[PDB]
Amino acid sequence: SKVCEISGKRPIVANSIQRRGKAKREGGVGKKTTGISKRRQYPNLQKVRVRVAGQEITFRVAASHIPKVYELVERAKGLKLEGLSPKEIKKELLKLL
Amino acid sequence: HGKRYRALLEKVDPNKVYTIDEAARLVKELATAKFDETVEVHAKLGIDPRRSDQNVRGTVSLPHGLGKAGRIEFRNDKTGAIHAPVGKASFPPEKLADNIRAFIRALEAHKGAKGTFLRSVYVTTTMGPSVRINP
Amino acid sequence: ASEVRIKLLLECTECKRRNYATEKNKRNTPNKLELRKYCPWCRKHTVHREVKI
RNA sequence: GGGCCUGACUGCGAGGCCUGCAAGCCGAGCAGGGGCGAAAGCCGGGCCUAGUGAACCGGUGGUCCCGUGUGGAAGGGCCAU
RNA sequence: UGGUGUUGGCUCUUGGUCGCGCCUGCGUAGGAUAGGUGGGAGCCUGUGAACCCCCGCCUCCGGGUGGGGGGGAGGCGCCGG
RNA sequence: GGGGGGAACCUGGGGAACUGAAACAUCUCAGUACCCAGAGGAGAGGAAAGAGAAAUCGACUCCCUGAGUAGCGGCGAGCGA
Ligand SMILES: [Mg+2]
Ligand SMILES: [Mg+2]
Ligand SMILES: [Mg+2]
Ligand SMILES: [Mg+2]
Ligand SMILES: [Mg+2]
Ligand SMILES: [Mg+2]
Ligand SMILES: [Mg+2]
Ligand SMILES: [Mg+2]
Ligand SMILES: [Mg+2]
Ligand SMILES: [Mg+2]
Ligand SMILES: [Mg+2]
Ligand SMILES: [Mg+2]
Ligand SMILES: [Mg+2]
Ligand SMILES: [Mg+2]
Ligand SMILES: [Mg+2]
Ligand SMILES: [Mg+2]
Ligand SMILES: [Mg+2]
Ligand SMILES: [Mg+2]
Ligand SMILES: [Mg+2]
Ligand SMILES: [Mg+2]
Ligand SMILES: [Mg+2]
Ligand SMILES: [Mg+2]
Ligand SMILES: [Mg+2]
Ligand SMILES: [Mg+2]
Ligand SMILES: [Mg+2]
Ligand SMILES: [Mg+2]
Ligand SMILES: [Mg+2]
Ligand SMILES: [Mg+2]
Ligand SMILES: [Mg+2]
Ligand SMILES: [Mg+2]
Ligand SMILES: [Mg+2]
Ligand SMILES: [Mg+2]
Ligand SMILES: [Mg+2]
Ligand SMILES: [Mg+2]
Ligand SMILES: [Mg+2]
Ligand SMILES: [Mg+2]
Ligand SMILES: [Mg+2]
Ligand SMILES: [Mg+2]
Ligand SMILES: [Mg+2]
Ligand SMILES: [Mg+2]
Ligand SMILES: [Mg+2]
Ligand SMILES: [Mg+2]
Ligand SMILES: [Mg+2]
Ligand SMILES: [Mg+2]
Ligand SMILES: [Mg+2]
Ligand SMILES: [Mg+2]
Ligand SMILES: [Mg+2]
Ligand SMILES: [Mg+2]
Ligand SMILES: [Zn+2]
Numbered sequence: 001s002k003v004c005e006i007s008g009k010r011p012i013v014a015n016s017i018q019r020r021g022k023a024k025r026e027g028g029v030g031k032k033t034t035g036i037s038k039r040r041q042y043p044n045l046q047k048v049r050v051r052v053a054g055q056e057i058t059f060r061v062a063a064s065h066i067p068k069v070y071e072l073v074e075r076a077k078g079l080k081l082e083g084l085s086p087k088e089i090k091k092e093l094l095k096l097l
Numbered sequence: 098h099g100k101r102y103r104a105l106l107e108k109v110d111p112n113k114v115y116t117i118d119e120a121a122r123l124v125k126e127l128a129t130a131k132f133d134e135t136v137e138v139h140a141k142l143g144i145d146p147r148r149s150d151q152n153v154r155g156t157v158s159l160p161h162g163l164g165k166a167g168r169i170e171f172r173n174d175k176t177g178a179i180h181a182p183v184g185k186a187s188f189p190p191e192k193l194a195d196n197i198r199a200f201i202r203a204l205e206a207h208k209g210a211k212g213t214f215l216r217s218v219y220v221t222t223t224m225g226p227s228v229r230i231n232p
Numbered sequence: 233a234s235e236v237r238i239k240l241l242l243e244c245t246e247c248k249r250r251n252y253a254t255e256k257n258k259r260n261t262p263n264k265l266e267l268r269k270y271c272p273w274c275r276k277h278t279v280h281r282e283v284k285i
Numbered sequence: 286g287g288g289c290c291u292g293a294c295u296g297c298g299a300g301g302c303c304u305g306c307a308a309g310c311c312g313a314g315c316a317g318g319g320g321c322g323a324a325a326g327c328c329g330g331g332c333c334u335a336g337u338g339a340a341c342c343g344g345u346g347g348u349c350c351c352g353u354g355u356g357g358a359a360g361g362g363c364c365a366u
Numbered sequence: 367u368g369g370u371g372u373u374g375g376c377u378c379u380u381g382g383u384c385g386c387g388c389c390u391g392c393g394u395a396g397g398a399u400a401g402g403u404g405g406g407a408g409c410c411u412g413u414g415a416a417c418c419c420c421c422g423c424c425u426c427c428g429g430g431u432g433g434g435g436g437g438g439a440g441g442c443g444c445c446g447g
Numbered sequence: 448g449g450g451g452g453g454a455a456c457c458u459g460g461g462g463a464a465c466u467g468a469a470a471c472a473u474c475u476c477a478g479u480a481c482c483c484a485g486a487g488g489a490g491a492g493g494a495a496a497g498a499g500a501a502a503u504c505g506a507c508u509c510c511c512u513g514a515g516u517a518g519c520g521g522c523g524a525g526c527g528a
Contacts, residue, residue, distance in 0.1 A: 013461075022343095029343050032521080033473050038462090046372050063372055100413055111386095130408090137405060146402095174403035182405070223406070241346085241366070250346055253366060254293065270318055272295050273347090277319055280291095285345085285366065 001042035004062040005094070006069065009043040053081035057090050072096055101129065101224055109226040117201065120220055120230045121184075121194030127225035128186035133164075134223030135183045138197065140204070140232065142177040143212035151210045153179070157203040161196040164188055171204055179204060186222065201232045242280035244271040252280060 003010045018035035022028020044063040049056060050073050059069050072093045081089055105127050115123070128134040144151035158169040164185045171181035184196045197220065205214060218232040233239055236259055242252040251271055265282035 010460095024343070027344060036473080044371060066372080098413095099410055102410090103413070132408070135405065139404095172403085176402050178403070180404045224409080239366090243346085248346090249348095250365065251295080252293090267291055267293095268319085269291070270294050272317090275295090275318070277291095277294090283346090 001045045002060070004043050004045065004065060005059050006061045006065040006072075006097070007043075009062050009064075011040045011042045013038055014041045015039070052076055052089055052093065053084065055084070055086045055089050057086055057093065059090070099224070102226075105225045109228065111226060111229075113229065115228055115230045117198050117230060117232075118191075118194050120228050121190055121197055123228060124184075124193070124220060124222055124225070125187055125190065127228075128222035130186075130224050134186040134225075136185055136193075136220065136222040136225075138181060138184070138200065138218065138220045140179045140201075140218040141216035142173060142179070143214045143216055144177060144210045146175055146177055148210075153204055153207055155204070155207050157200055160199055161188070161192060169200070171200075205232075239285050240265065240282050241285050242267060242269060243283045244269075244274060244278045245281050246278045247271060247273045249273055250283065253285065256282070 001011065015036050016039050017033060020032045020034045021030055024030045045060055046063050046066070047058060048061050048066060048069050049058040050069060051057070052073055053076075061069055075096045076093055079092055081092060084092070108123070108126050124136045128136055142153070153171070153173040156168050156170055159166045161167070161184075163169060163183055169182050171179050173179055181200070184193050184200075187193070188196070201218060208214060215232055218230055219227040220230055221227040233255060237255055237257045239253065239255050241250040242254065242265065243250045249271070251273075252269055254265075256265055267280050268277050269280045270276070271278045271280070
């Protein structure tokens with residue numbers, strides 16, 4: 001799981017904080033932290049294949065921005081895309097952002 | 098399920114909530130018989146039926162009264178309700194919406210119990226359908 | 233104290249405040265403790281009753 | 286042993302004992318409201334010396350002191366446990 | 367390993383609960399299959415009675431209820447054991 | 448147009464341990480050392496969806512002060528606007 005091609009979401013570094021005890025709101029003495037360590041939080045990357053100008057274009061995008069792709073496809077209706085290789089097609093789509 | 102019971106079935110929208118100054122104009126066309134008819138007002142409560150303090154004990158009536166200042170009784174059941182007389186079939190309008198207006202606010206004057214004391218208050222005649230209204 | 237010799241408060245029966253803390257044996261004294269005592273709020277002696285601590 | 290009773294008080298406390306600290310101990314007397322006694326008086330638990338646990342965190346009952354622009358509320362302070 | 371995203375179509379059996387209707391409620395005196403309280407001397411019929419034909423049924427085996435085909439003037443309660 | 452280099456300085460991405468807590472795990476050391484990417488003679492930041500109580504101020508940076516204050520904190524060691 002890497003980076004979103006639409007939103008640019010990357011993995012972030014987050015802490016897993018291990019806690020113990022009863023919150024003071026629940027009448028307890030309070031929370032004691034029994035461990036902090038680093039983990040990562042990855043974007044919900046998924047594969048999105050779309051047909052644009054006869055070519056099969058696929059995006060690695062976070063699920064959050066899945067529609068943003070289809071939006072991009074609609075925006076590609078007025079583009080001289082015919083003849084192009086999949087790679088440069090995607091570039092044109094991406095450039096519409 | 099009589100000839101007059103379903104001839105009031107298109108004098109009633111049982112899927113419509115009314116006000117008090119509009120449910121006395123629609124209980125005279127629902128009360129038409131060969132003798133006089135007690136147009137009965139009923140209501141669902143909101144207390145515990147096995148708690149001995151949450152009972153409804155008392156009397157009213159006024160401004161006007163019965164019909165035959167006519168202190169009408171009203172008491173609850175062993176599953177929570179009321180069932181009380183009267184304001185019979187004319188007994189003029191806007192003096193029937195005025196005798197139906199100082200009784201709904203009587204029983205609400207005998208409340209710390211649990212659950213809203215204002216549920217379902219249906220006004221039906223001796224031989225008619227039931228109007229939902231607003232207590 | 234012990235399980236059978238408990239701790240308790242005496243609540244002023246008039247203003248319902250707790251002014252005294254003491255102990256009793258609940259096998260010996262199953263009934264609620266009842267004693268007259270000076271309530272600093274009421275500024276007079278008042279029957280005080282055992283309430284749980 | 287028996288009557289009445291709740292001082293197994295509330296607000297203070299001169300003065301000391303002990304003592305590195307922190308504690309621990311004894312305490313007359315003044316006021317409040319009481320108990321017993323005709324009264325002098327005595328009564329701030331128990332013949333005495335063991336029967337115990339500093340702070341920190343937090344619970345419950347008061348108080349109504351603070352309340353993050355203002356009124357509240359959350360939260361906390363104080364008294365008690 | 368549960369929930370959720372990626373993750374959609376159809377079908378069947380389903381369920382929570384919200385409302386509504388039609389119904390189900392038989393310890394014992396008893397007309398006799400009495401849910402809780404209540405209003406109420408009239409109600410139900412040319413919106414077709416009383417007995418029949420197929421009964422959706424339930425039923426403590428006596429009974430409770432509904433539709434239409436036969437079907438043309440009673441039934442059901444007051445009273446009061 | 449890019450590529451690579453530059454003592455130290457700078458921003459961004461990542462990011463320790465000894466140590467201190469006279470043991471240790473939350474805390475500390477410290478977002479330090481270090482790795483990486485980028486920038487330039489500087490870099491960052493920068494024209495209020497701001498402060499925060501002044502019915503007030505008016506981009507940002509930098510120094511003095513506010514201040515070891517407010518607070519944070521196994522309310523410990525310490526950290527600290
Ligand atoms: Mg975690
Ligand atoms: Mg903590
Ligand atoms: Mg996909
Ligand atoms: Mg979404
Ligand atoms: Mg005490
Ligand atoms: Mg004792
Ligand atoms: Mg006081
Ligand atoms: Mg003796
Ligand atoms: Mg004695
Ligand atoms: Mg004695
Ligand atoms: Mg006396
Ligand atoms: Mg006292
Ligand atoms: Mg001294
Ligand atoms: Mg000393
Ligand atoms: Mg001691
Ligand atoms: Mg005195
Ligand atoms: Mg005296
Ligand atoms: Mg005397
Ligand atoms: Mg005296
Ligand atoms: Mg004294
Ligand atoms: Mg001691
Ligand atoms: Mg500590
Ligand atoms: Mg505390
Ligand atoms: Mg205040
Ligand atoms: Mg004070
Ligand atoms: Mg405020
Ligand atoms: Mg105030
Ligand atoms: Mg505020
Ligand atoms: Mg206000
Ligand atoms: Mg408080
Ligand atoms: Mg408070
Ligand atoms: Mg999982
Ligand atoms: Mg799923
Ligand atoms: Mg260069
Ligand atoms: Mg960095
Ligand atoms: Mg860095
Ligand atoms: Mg590492
Ligand atoms: Mg360490
Ligand atoms: Mg150490
Ligand atoms: Mg050391
Ligand atoms: Mg060691
Ligand atoms: Mg740090
Ligand atoms: Mg370089
Ligand atoms: Mg360059
Ligand atoms: Mg900039
Ligand atoms: Mg601007
Ligand atoms: Mg300017
Ligand atoms: Mg720090
Ligand atoms: Zn008191």
